[PDB]
Design an enzyme around this catalytic site. Structure first.
Site, PDB file in Angstrom:
ATOM      1  CG  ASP A  15      -0.071   0.052   2.272  1.00 30.27           C
ATOM      2  OD1 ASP A  15      -1.100   0.424   3.504  1.00 30.27           O
ATOM      3  OD2 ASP A  15       0.799   0.120   2.817  1.00 30.27           O
ATOM      4  NE  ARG A  29      -2.119   3.068   3.727  1.00 30.91           N
ATOM      5  CZ  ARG A  29      -3.420   3.280   3.027  1.00 30.91           C
ATOM      6  NH1 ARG A  29      -3.252   3.106   1.794  1.00 30.91           N
ATOM      7  NH2 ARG A  29      -3.727   2.078   4.001  1.00 30.91           N
ATOM      8  CG  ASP A  34      -7.602  -0.337   4.049  1.00 26.91           C
ATOM      9  OD1 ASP A  34      -6.990   0.378   4.933  1.00 26.91           O
ATOM     10  OD2 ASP A  34      -8.306  -0.196   5.102  1.00 26.91           O
ATOM     11  CB  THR A  35      -2.311  -4.125   0.435  1.00 28.32           C
ATOM     12  OG1 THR A  35      -1.437  -3.159   1.514  1.00 28.32           O
ATOM     13  CG2 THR A  35      -2.509  -4.010  -0.393  1.00 28.32           C
ATOM     14  CD  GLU A  37      -0.435  -2.290   7.053  1.00 26.91           C
ATOM     15  OE1 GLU A  37      -1.558  -1.902   7.770  1.00 26.91           O
ATOM     16  OE2 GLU A  37       0.553  -1.615   6.580  1.00 26.91           O
ATOM     17  NE  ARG A  81       1.696   7.120   5.185  1.00 24.65           N
ATOM     18  CZ  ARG A  81       1.034   5.825   5.575  1.00 24.65           C
ATOM     19  NH1 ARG A  81       0.952   3.984   4.935  1.00 24.65           N
ATOM     20  NH2 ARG A  81      -0.724   5.803   6.222  1.00 24.65           N
TER      21      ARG A  81
END
EC number: 3.1.31.1
Length: 135
Positions: A15, A29, A34-35, A37, A81
């Site tokens: 991500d 970002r 949402d991956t 992580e 980010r």
């Protein structure tokens, strides 16, 4: 919205990618996804985390052109980010991940939601195909 050119510096996770943007190194970002992580010690390496991370890495390392597209709201988060849609040869990385079942659509914050519907439609297809996190 408009796309702007950037140069890959390094893929950090599913991500997050670091890019040269306007001649400055910046961590980005990916918006709205949402991956699982590989980072954060709360759980450390989650299931499908290495897979999501390899997917993003490959897709950005193998591109001829990377472009960043900011949304209509805030362009950075509280960690500094950039918040953006990232494109590799014209293909949005955010959508590609969701379409493959390697990310879910995140909780959305208006007005940074321009591609929300398009992403939710890809997420519904990946669930229907039972890919990866949906298997």
């Amino acid at each position: 919205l408009h796309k702007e050119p950037a140069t890959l510096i390094k893929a950090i996770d599913g991500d997050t990618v670091k890019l040269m943007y306007k001649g400055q190194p910046m961590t980005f970002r990916l918006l709205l996804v949402d991956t699982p992580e590989t980072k954060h010690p709360k759980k450390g390496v989650e299931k499908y985390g290495p897979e999501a991370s390899a997917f993003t890495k490959k897709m950005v390392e193998n591109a001829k052109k990377i472009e960043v597209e900011f949304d209509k709201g805030q362009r950075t988060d509280k960690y500094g980010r950039g918040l953006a849609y990232i494109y590799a040869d014209g293909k949005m990385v955010n959508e590609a991940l969701v379409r493959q079942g390697l990310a879910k659509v995140a909780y959305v914050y208006k007005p940074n939601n321009s591609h929300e519907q398009h992403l939710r439609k890809s997420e519904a297809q990946a669930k229907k195909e039972k890919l990866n996190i949906w298997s």
